[PDB]
Amino acid sequence: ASMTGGQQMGTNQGKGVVAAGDKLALFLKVFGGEVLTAFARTSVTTSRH
């Protein structure tokens, strides 16, 4: 069937908080380290003339 009393480590389940959507909210979002440059943009000429 289905299981109850799950002990969800997520979900606010705090005093009087509205019946919360997201069973998974209350988890921090960490950052990867993959900052993106938007490319070198090169050039041209510069010792052509």
Partner: protein, 49 residues
């Protein structure tokens, strides 16, 4: 391009805008005419089981 994380539920990467130069009149303010890079980020969510 694969990258793997530990712990947290959501992984976010920041991106940057890149700028555009300008001329400066003699005896004139530079700080008066300047635009920031207005860099914004984007995020991918871990999914489920």
């Amino acid at each position: 391009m694969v990258r793997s994380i530990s712990s947290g539920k959501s992984a976010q990467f920041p991106v940057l805008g890149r700028t555009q130069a300008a001329y400066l009149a003699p005896g004139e303010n530079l700080d008066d005419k300047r635009k920031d890079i207005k860099h914004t980020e984007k995020v991918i969510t871990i999914d489920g089981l």
